[PDB]
Amino acid sequence: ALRVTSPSVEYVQRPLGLDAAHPRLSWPMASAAPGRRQSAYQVRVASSAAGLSHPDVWDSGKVVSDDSVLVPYAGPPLKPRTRYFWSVRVWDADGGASEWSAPSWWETGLMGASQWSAKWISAPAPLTEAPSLEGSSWIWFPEGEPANSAPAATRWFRRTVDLPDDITGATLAISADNVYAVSVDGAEVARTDLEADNEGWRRPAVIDVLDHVHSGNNTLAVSASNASVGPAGWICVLVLTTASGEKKIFSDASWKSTDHEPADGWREPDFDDSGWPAAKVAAAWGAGPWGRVAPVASAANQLRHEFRLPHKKVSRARLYATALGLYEAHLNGRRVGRDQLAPGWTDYRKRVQYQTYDVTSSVRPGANALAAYVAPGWYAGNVGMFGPHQYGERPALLAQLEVEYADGTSERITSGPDWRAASGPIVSADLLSGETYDARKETAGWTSPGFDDRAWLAVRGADNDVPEQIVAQVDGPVRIAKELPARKVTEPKPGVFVLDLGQNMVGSVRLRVSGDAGTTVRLRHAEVLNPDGTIYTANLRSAAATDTYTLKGQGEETYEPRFTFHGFRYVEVTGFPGKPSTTSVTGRVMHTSAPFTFEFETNVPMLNKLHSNITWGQRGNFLSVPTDTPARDERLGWTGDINVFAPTAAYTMESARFLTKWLVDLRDAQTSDGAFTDVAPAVGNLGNGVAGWGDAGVTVPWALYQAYGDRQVLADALPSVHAWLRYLEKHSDGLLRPADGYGDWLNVSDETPKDVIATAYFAHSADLAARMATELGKDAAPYTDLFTRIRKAFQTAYVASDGKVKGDTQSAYVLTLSMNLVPDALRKAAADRLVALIEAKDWHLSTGFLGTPRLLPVLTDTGHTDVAYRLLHQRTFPSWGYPIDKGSTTMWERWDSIQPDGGFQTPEMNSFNHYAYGSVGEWMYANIAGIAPGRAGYRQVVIRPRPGGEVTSARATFASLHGPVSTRWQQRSGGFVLTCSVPPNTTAEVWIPADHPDRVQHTHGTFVRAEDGCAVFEVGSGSHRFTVKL
C-alpha cells in the first residue's frame, strides 16, 4: 500500500508562528510497489491530535485530484496564536485508501499588527550615542578665515588643563579637516594619516584615554594638517567622568597655536608656549562647511525586565519578538532559541519580520526575568560601502511574552517604559567592522530574576519610524549549521598566529583563552593568504572584519560573537597569552535554516570538489538575503548574481522559502516606473533597469516554479513582471534596448555588446511572462505577441545571414541559442561558430556572469556534450579546475582572482566567494546525475545521464517536494547499468545510451522510441533498473 511520509506545511515540518491565511500542505508518499498515482485526498484539521477523528476545524472530504504538493488550506478562517493539528490520507489509482498520516501540526502567529500590545523600546541616549562634539568649536591657527580657506599646511596646538579629582572614566572624541595627531602629557593617543584620508573629518574617532589622564594639570597637544588649499579646522571634546557628574574640555580659544614647526619637547608639559597666539575658532559645531558631524556608536546594549507570574500550572508560553536592529533574547538565565542575527534584513520602512519561540518550559511561578541584547545590524550599522544609519540611528526592540494557564487565564508581559538598560560587555557590534567585547563589563546574573539593576537606566520609547507591516519571518532564520575546528596553527611573524579552518566559511568563531584580566585578543578574518603565510585582507576594502575580546581572568574563557559575521578561511590571532592551539578557535558556520537537498558523487575527485565548492559558495551567501559576497564591505542582495545562480541553488538547498522572501524584498524595491533595482533591499543609490540584473524579478520566480512547481510564486510575481515589461518597452526604440548595463560581467577578454545583451534579456522576459500567464490559466497572447515582436527586431539587428551574431563572442552565441533568439535555420551555424571560438581559445571558455550559466547547457542542446565535458574537466586558466588546483573551497568572483603569475587581482573588486560561476552546478545535476524536471516541480522527471569526459560512474539523490529522486549509473567492461528511484505520484522519462536500442533490459516501464543513441523509456514511480551488456 501507499503511505504518507513527512507531511509539511509551507515547506517545513511543524512551523511555529506561521501567518499564511491558506497554508500550503504537502504529502510525499512512499510505496514498495512501482507505478503509483494519487486519485484522491482528504485533509482533516482539528484543535487536537485526538480530535482528528471528529474534526472541529476542517474536513475537505474526499477530493478527486492528483495534487499532493502545496495544496492550500481551504477551510474556515484561521485564528491567531492557535495550534492546528492535521492529517491526510489518499487513494491510489485503484481506490485503496492509505492510513491517515501520523498527526502533525502548524501554529499561527499573531496574524496582524492589532495583536501586538508591546511598545518599541531603545536604550537611552547615554548608552546609544557616542560622546558628542556638541558644545565644542572647530579651531585652527589664527590665519584668515579657516572655515572658508586655509593654506595646505600643518599647524600645532597646545592646552594645559586642570582636571578634577577621582576620575573614573575619560573619553576623547576628535575630528579634523584633514588629519590630526593628538597626545596627552607627551604620549600620542590617536592619529589619522594624510595618505589614508578620504574626508575623514566626517567620521570623528572616540578614544578611551583613562590610561593617560590624571587629576591636576594635563597637557594636551595636537598637530593637524590641511591637505590642500581650502577649509581647515579640528574639533574635540575630552569628557571626564567622576561620581559627581561629567566635566567637558573643548577645542576653543583657550588653546595656544603656532604656524612654525616647534622645537622638540612641544608635546611635553613644561614646553614654553607663552609666545604662541590663541587658537582661532573657525566655526562652532554645526557651523562652517562641516555640519552636524557626530561620532558613531555601535554598542549592543542590555535591556531587561523582571516580573511576577502566578503559581498556577502553565499550559503554554510564547515569545514573539523583533528588532529594528538585531536582538538576542534571554528568559530566566537561558538564551531563547537558536537563531543568529534575528530578525534579518528587510526594507524596515515597509516591513520587519518577527520570530516566535516556544518558551513553555522556561517560565516560572513567581519571579521571572526577560532580557535582550539589542544591536545596530543592518538597520543602523554599516551596510555595504555606504556607512551606518541606513534606516535609523538607534536600535529598538519589540517583545511580547504570552503565558496561558491550564485554568484558561493568561498573562502578557511586554517591552515598554518599565524596562531598564545598561551598556554591558558588547562595546561595539557591526556587521562589517566586527564586534568588540570586554568581559570585565559583564553583569553576572542579569538574565535571571533577583538581579540588582537599581543603577541601570530607564529605557526610552524608540523614535524610529514604525514599519508599515510586522510579518512572521518567511525565510528560515539564520542558525549555526556546523562547526569547523582549526586544522592547523602557524606563526608567520612573532606572536601573530594564523589558524586555518580548511574551508572558506561564513559566520564567526568561538575563541577559548585563559589569561590575565585585561588581556586583549584580536581576531582578524581573511579569505586567502599572502605567499609569506600572513593573512591578506586588502580585498575586504573598508570591512575590518575584526573581533576584539578583553579577558576577565576567569579560567578557560569562551568568547562567541553575536552581532557580526565574516567570510573567511583563516583567522589571525594577536595578543593571545602564550600559544594558541587548534582548540583555541572553531568556526561556527551560519546560514538560513534550510536543508541541503542534493547529494552528488562521481568517480572524479575534481568534480566532487567542484560540487562541494558550489554548496559552500551558496550557503555562505544565503544569510537573510542572497548576497554577492559575505566578506568585503558589500554583502548586498544583487539581482544579477541570483538571476544566474537560482536554478543551481534550487537543486542544492531548499531555496523556496529563502527566495520567496527575497522576491518580496525585490518587489518592495521596484521603482514607481516599474524598474527592478540592481540590489534588493535597495540601499546606497545603486541603479535600476539593468538587463540580466533587474530580470531576476522574472527569472527567479520561474526558476522556483521549475524546481518546486510553486504556482503561488508565479501569481505573486506576475503583476511586477507586467510592470517591468512595460518599463522595458518604454525604454527601447523599435524594441531594441540601449547598450547600457553591466553586460556579460567579468568575461575573459571577450566583451559582448551591451545592446545585444539588453535586447536578448527583454525578449526572454517577455517569453517567460507568456509561460507564467499560461501556467496560471491567464491570457498569454499579449506576452507571446510581445516576445514574437522582440525576437524579430532582435534577429534583424544582430543576426547575420550566415548565423553570426554581433560581437562574435562566446556569450553572444550562448545567449541567443539559449533564449531561442537565433532563427531555427541558423542554429546549427551559430552553434558551430561557438564551438569554433572555444576551439580557438585552446578549449577554454571566455564567458562572464551572464554567459557562463547557459554555456554547458547550450553546448549539450546543440549536440556538443563532448565539448561541454572538455570545458568541464579543463584544469588550465580560465576554467573551474584552475581555482580548484589553487586550493579554492568556494567559487571566486573572477576567473583569475588569483592570477596565473601567482598575484591577486585588484583589491578594488576581488572576492573569493561569489556563487555566480557555481551556476555550472545545474548542468552537472541535469546531465551527469541525469535529474531534471520534465514537468514543473518534477511531476515528471527526465532521467538522461550523458556519460562523457572522465566520468564513468555517478550517484545522486535530489530531495524533491514529492520525495527522493535518486540515480546511480556505471559504465564498465562495455556494459551500462542505471538504477533509479522515482517517488509515488510522479513519472519519469528515462534515456539509456545503447548501440542497439531494443536490446536494453529493463525491470519496469515501456520502451517508446530510439533517439540520439538511446532507448527512451516511460516509467511510473518505484525502483527501476536498466542494463545494456555488450
Ligand SMILES: [Ca+2]
Ligand atoms: Ca581641508
